[PDB]
Every structure is written in structure tokens, then in C-alpha cells.
Subunit: 94 residues, 4 copies
Amino acid sequence: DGNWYWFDNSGEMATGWKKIADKWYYFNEEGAMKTGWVKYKDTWYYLDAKEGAMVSNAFIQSADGTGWYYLKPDGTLADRPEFTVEPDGLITVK
Amino acid sequence: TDGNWYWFDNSGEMATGWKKIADKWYYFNEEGAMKTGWVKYKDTWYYLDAKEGAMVSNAFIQSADGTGWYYLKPDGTLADRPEFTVEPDGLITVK
Amino acid sequence: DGNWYWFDNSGEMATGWKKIADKWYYFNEEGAMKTGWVKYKDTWYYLDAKEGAMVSNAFIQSADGTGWYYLKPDGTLADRPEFTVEPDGLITVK
Amino acid sequence: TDGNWYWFDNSGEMATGWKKIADKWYYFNEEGAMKTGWVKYKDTWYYLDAKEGAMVSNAFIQSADGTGWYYLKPDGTLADRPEFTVEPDGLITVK
Ligand SMILES: C[N+](C)(C)CCO
Ligand SMILES: C[N+](C)(C)CCO
Ligand SMILES: C[N+](C)(C)CCO
Ligand SMILES: C[N+](C)(C)CCO
Ligand SMILES: C[N+](C)(C)CCO
Ligand SMILES: C[N+](C)(C)CCO
Ligand SMILES: C[N+](C)(C)CCO
Ligand SMILES: C[N+](C)(C)CCO
Ligand SMILES: C[N+](C)(C)CCO
Ligand SMILES: C[N+](C)(C)CCO
Ligand SMILES: C[N+](C)(C)CCO
Ligand SMILES: C[N+](C)(C)CCO
């Protein structure tokens, strides 16, 4: 097995976050593209397990299948305090 | 023109209210006209695919104004506030 | 079991072809919506087995799984003489 | 900026040519750069998903000019004229 890497036209190897053709990918310090949950500077993001792209404004099923986590439009995971569920059930996040 | 879809069984009986056809659920009003969008069925809300009429279930659908989302349980019913338990790390649970 | 029917706002029951909200459906003479292959006035069309809508500009797998039939943009089935397969393999239809 | 995707195995060997990763096929040029779009591999043509790089198979894809379609066999190879047998009623068969 192995991993995916990315090098811009100038030969620079991508490490960390990198916008690649309208999508965002996260590479560890060695350049290896990461998939799944990633904690970057005390903040959580979710990278598609298939093509590795960051998911945003979406709900992703918990591991224990007990519930869902919401990823804000910028990709960051929303905390409980950020939610305001209105009486009818409308889920709002800040 | 404009109109509505209806379903009559082989016996000739016009479908009305909830009806399960070919493994999908549909809701017809009192006049047999297939409903789409939000439908209130005795205190609870449901959502029928706006384009195909089948009841949506276990899905989050964006709000009309786009300000938030709504969640439809696996039984089709719309989860209202009392049913939510948003855990501290953000894990959303519905019962 | 039963079938789907359609009545416009004026109470007229649809029979034959009917454009319904950007899609086309075929109803037999008794009003019952048809799905699958349909022969109308010596010409073949294919109505989606799921939602009954006519498919156009698409290839649909044969029953015997031996090949595919091509439905032109207007929904009608293309005959052999209508095809011109270019050397590289480009499939063109008239 | 602009650039290219590459794949190095855990051993450090740069993937080149055809490579099957996580159950999908990809094609890297001589410089290890992942190819997308049409690729000629020894007399035959293949098509790699323009957005994700994986080889398309058993699929009809619209032509660039939109004038016709192309068919990719289940093994990825592009079917050329000699392989087509269009039956009289319109049944398209490929071998
Ligand atoms: C080492 N690589 C060839 C992968 C980078 C481009 O120079
Ligand atoms: C990534 N986890 C879901 C495991 C942490 C809680 O956010
Ligand atoms: C309360 N609902 C939002 C479900 C009905 C539409 O107004
Ligand atoms: C009057 N209908 C044709 C709708 C009933 C027989 O199915
Ligand atoms: C006939 N169906 C109800 C299945 C299609 C919705 O337009
Ligand atoms: C799930 N349904 C509400 C559609 C069935 C009970 O009538
Ligand atoms: C007989 N229908 C009620 C189904 C048609 C509308 O008048
Ligand atoms: C509808 N059939 C495919 C059976 C006839 C040949 O076009
Ligand atoms: C012959 N192909 C069309 C497959 C190559 C692009 O020109
Ligand atoms: C130089 N690389 C980091 C690309 C090889 C080790 O996997
Ligand atoms: C990293 N993948 C090659 C899987 C995504 C294509 O952009
Ligand atoms: C189907 N492939 C051509 C990708 C495998 C043989 O190398």
C-alpha cells in the first residue's frame, strides 16, 4: 500500500491544507494525503474516505451509529453551543 | 396544462390518504390527488418528494429559507425540538 | 395492485402521450400509465420502469443482456440504418 | 497553483503506468503524474475520470463535440468500429 501526494508545477510538495481544483485536501507533514477525521490546530475537519476531499455543510453519521456530526460551510465541526434547534425542529448553527 | 396524479387499484378504488405503492410511501389528499412537499398528518409533519411524491425518510433536508436543516426520522416523521439531544462534542442524536 | 392516472385541473383524464412538468408519460386508452417498452403508431419508446417518465438520448440494456438500444433525443428508438460508427468507434445517429 | 497527483507505496516506489489502488484503476505517466481524460496505452484507448482519475469501464460517454458517443468495454478499452455489430432492430452489440 501507500498514499497519494501532490506536487505543484514548481516541484513543491503539498503538506497541510491545499486547495486543489475547487476542493480541499489535507496532507500530513510527510506529504501523505489524509482521509477521515483530522484535528488541525485544535479544530476538527472531515476528509472524504473515498477521494479525500474535505466535506462541508453536511451531516456525517457517527462511528457508533448513534447520531450525526455537522460540518459547517467552512468544513469545521460544530459544537453543541453552536446549535439552536427551534421548536418545530429546525436545526440552526452558528 | 396543470393537474394531479391519482392511483386506482385494479378494483377501481381511488387511493386516498397514505398508500404504499411498489415499496414507497405516498400520501393522497381527500380528493385522491397525490401530495408533494410538506404534509401534516395528525399533529406530525412529513415530507413528500416535491418531484416524485414518495415520502422522504432518515434524511436531512435544507430549510426553505436555507437558514437551517430539518431531519426526517426513518419512519418519515419530522423530528421536533423535544426529540433532539445534541451531545457536547456536537453529536446530534434523535429519539 | 393498480395504476397511476392523471387528471388536469379541468377534470380531463390523460390518455396517450402527456407532457407533465418537463417530463413525458404515456397512458393507455383507459388512462393507466405505462412503463417499459411501448409501441405507438409503429414507433418504439421506452418509459422508465420506476417513475414512468420517457427516457431520451440514452442507452438502455437489452433484456437478454446481449447489447443496448439507443433512444434518440426525441425518445424514439434508433434503427440500424440510422447508425454510423466511425473507425475509432464514435457512435453517430440520425 | 496547478500541479499533479502522485502515489508512492510504503516502500517509497513511485507509481508509474497502470496501478490499481483501493479497487480502482489509475494510470500514471512516466513521471508518476496521474493522467486524466483519454490515454493511449499501446494501440488502445482508455478514459480516466477527468475529475477523479479512475478508469471508466462499461460506460458510454458523450463525445467532445457532442456529435456521438463512445463506449468503453468492461475492461476499460475503447471499442473501435470493427468490434461493433449493430443488429437490424437497433440492438448494439460489442465484442
Ligand atoms: C519527485 N517528483 C517527480 C514526484 C516531483 C516532480 O519533480
Ligand atoms: C473525531 N471524533 C468524532 C472521534 C471526535 C469528536 O468530534
Ligand atoms: C413546520 N414546517 C416547517 C414543517 C411546515 C412548513 O411551514
Ligand atoms: C375510472 N377509472 C378508469 C379511473 C377506474 C378504473 O380503473
Ligand atoms: C408516476 N410517479 C408518481 C411515480 C412519478 C412522479 O411524477
Ligand atoms: C410510515 N407511515 C406513516 C407511512 C405508515 C403508517 O401509516
Ligand atoms: C375523478 N377524479 C376525482 C379522480 C377526477 C377530478 O374530478
Ligand atoms: C421492444 N423490443 C426491444 C422487444 C423490440 C425491438 O425494438
Ligand atoms: C480517438 N479518441 C477520440 C479516443 C482520442 C481523442 O482524440
Ligand atoms: C519522498 N516521498 C515522501 C515522496 C517518499 C516517501 O514515501
Ligand atoms: C485523490 N484522488 C485521486 C482519489 C482524488 C482525485 O482528485
Ligand atoms: C484493465 N487494465 C488494462 C487496467 C489491467 C491490465 O493491465
